[PDB]
Amino acid sequence: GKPSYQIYMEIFETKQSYDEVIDSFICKQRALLAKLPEGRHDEETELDFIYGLMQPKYRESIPRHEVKTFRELLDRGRTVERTRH
Amino acid sequence: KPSYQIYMEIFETKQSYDEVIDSFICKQRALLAKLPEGRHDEETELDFIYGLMQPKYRESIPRHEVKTFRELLDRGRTVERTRH
């Protein structure tokens, strides 16, 4: 297969692209996060991993400290995308 | 210190060419410790940084053969002593 350490390398090499939507990015990251050992990380941690990997428009507009879940994060990210076409 | 920036630093800080294992692990353990106490076990902290090492350490030290940083330092010193 593929060992935990290589997954972390993939997670942190998988940054959001300049035209990639938040729904796409979180799907991608959550799939990798699921290849990790079941029970290791809570959602707060999984959010910490990836928050800095989002594209700049989302980090400027969505303070990490205002989000507690992937649902809360997706909702604001879609909100971000729906205001600039 | 916001956990997500620490993680971004951890994985932005790969071991450089000719940087010895003590130098690299020092650096990372400093970052690993800025995280909330108790979040990660040592098995996880090794997984974080293991892929960040240079090829000679990974080529010679299988991740599955170390359980602690001390075991990692000891083999990493051995790798460096093979060329001294």
Numbering used by the authors:
A (entry chain B): 4 to 88
B (entry chain A): 5 to 88
Copy out sentences from the published article reporting this entry, exactly as the authors wrote them.
One of the key proteins in long-term synaptic plasticity and memory is the activity-regulated cytoskeleton-associated protein (Arc). Drosophila has two isoforms of Arc, dArc1 and dArc2, with low sequence similarity to mammalian Arc, but lacking a large N-terminal domain. Both dArc isoforms are related to the Ty3/gypsy retrotransposon capsid, consisting of N- and C-terminal lobes. As opposed to the corresponding mammalian Arc lobe domains, which are monomeric, the dArc lobes were all oligomeric in solution, indicating a strong propensity for homophilic interactions.
Each monomer consists of five helices in an orthogonal bundle fold, and the structures are highly similar to each other. The dimer interface is in both cases formed by α1 and α3 from each monomer, and the total buried surface area at the interface is ~1400 Å2. Both interfaces contain four hydrogen bonds and four salt bridges. The interface is conserved, displaying only three conservative replacements between the isoforms (A125/L170/F172 in dArc1 to S112/F157/Y159 in dArc2). (D) A comparison of the dArc-CL crystal structures with the same domains in dArc capsids. Both the dArc1 and dArc2 C-lobes closely resemble their counterparts in the capsids, with an all-atom RMSD of 1.75 Å2 and 1.13 Å2, respectively. The dimer interface in dArc-CL, which corresponds to that in retroviral CA-CTD, contains mainly hydrophobic interactions; half of these hydrophobic residues are polar in the rat Arc-CL, and the first helix of the dArc-CL, a major part of the dimer interface, is tilted away in mArc, possibly explaining the monomeric state of mArc-CL in solution. The most conserved residue (Gln124 in dArc2) is structurally important, forming hydrogen bonds and contacts with many neighbours, including the conserved residues Phe133 and Met162. Kratky plots also indicate that dArc1-CL is more flexible than dArc2-CL.
